[PDB]
Amino acid sequence: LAPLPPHVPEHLVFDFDMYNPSNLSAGVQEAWAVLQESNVPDLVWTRCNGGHWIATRGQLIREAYEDYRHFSSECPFIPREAGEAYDFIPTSMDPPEQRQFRALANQVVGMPVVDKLENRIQELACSLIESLRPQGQCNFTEDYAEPFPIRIFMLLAGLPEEDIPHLKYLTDQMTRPDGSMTFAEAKEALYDYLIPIIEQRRQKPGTDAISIVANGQVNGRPITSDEAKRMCGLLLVGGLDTVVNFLSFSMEFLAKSPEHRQELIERPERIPAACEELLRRFSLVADGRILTSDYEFHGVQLKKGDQILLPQMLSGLDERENACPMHVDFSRQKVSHTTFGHGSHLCLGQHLARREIIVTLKEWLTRIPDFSIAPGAQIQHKSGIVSGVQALPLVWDPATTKAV
Ligand code: HEM
């Protein structure tokens, strides 16, 4: 624990550890929910991980994300050293600078692009599932959750499939380091990989994501190689960790709820609604901002330079905006959440993600309508900037499956 700063009131202290919260064994969402019990203030200070603020209610979380003037993305991660080193684009920029870079990225992952890659998305899902179907078992996270999104990125970025193993490796070191290299090294390794492709597509442009970004213009002038690699880095990692883990949370729930499986099988038209409800219940991201100056927020004095965690995960779990928040109801009428963020940085891949989720639910239940958690298995969760599932062993009787 770090020594409490003089300007911080002792009665607002609540030492929550975002990387190792208590009661994690009861579920990661449930663990963060402790920040929402009646005896916990709307805004608290934890002495963990260097010391920082934490907004615990949807109201404050949304407000801080809207106000970039006071809450800057220049240092969006906790601990400070990590946020300071972070330089991906446009996640580490504030408007107006961010505006142009965000518009360019929107061109490679926006809705229009989704509708065009869908055949490959649906095709990829079916291929992956059919290959597992006969087995009667699988480790969902390793066998589907991971391969699905990374193959989608290779397609949109126009990269060859033989590069997946190496990219998977580099991305794994940027969140699950084995020791071979430290973030910075993996980043450079990634940049080393991207720079050549970028320079080459500058003169020989294709219709892929890299081509578009490489030939982009900002501030009336051509984007630099430095800016291009920093944007491409995000385009790669942005849709991995999030999708892999979200799909895992979703499948873990369905594996433990036969009635919900049956609901979607009998009422397929409800899958898009089911997707939104799962996004609320199993929200998983939590990054933050840094104070640009001294500022009084909701009766609390914030000091310039202070870091504040604004858990996107917590908004939809706030009992003040969603009744019985831990209950999953595909018929819930006013599903509110900030799972994809809020404000100027609202997730650009949100449309792609939903398509990935919906296609997955539809194609999996079509071929493997009945499945369960492997007997004796005890699912483990992990907590951080992007919380998730360690592994998810599933089992089923092939006799109940169907090839389509
Ligand atoms: C279940 C999946 C997803 C979730 C929960 C999610 C979540 C988020 C969140 C919360 C942010 C904003 C962070 C902040 O304000 O600092 C964001 C940003 C972003 N996401 Fe996603 N994401 C998902 C998938 C995707 C996908 C599929 C990609 C595509 C490569 C992607 C690309 C981006 C990009 C480009 C941004 C930065 C936008 C900006 O700074 O202007 N995301 N995402």
Ligand SMILES: CN(C)c1cccc2c(S(=O)(=O)NCCCCNC(=O)[C@]34C[C@H]5C[C@H](C[C@H](C5)C3)C4)cccc12
């Ligand atoms: C557990 N502790 C100690 C850590 C271990 C290893 C790396 C860490 C890092 S790190 O080096 O910055 N690595 C992780 C983050 C890099 C990849 N992800 C992204 O940019 C984001 C940017 C947006 C917000 C979320 C979700 C998605 C969009 C992708 C994160 C930060 C904080 C703690 C870390």
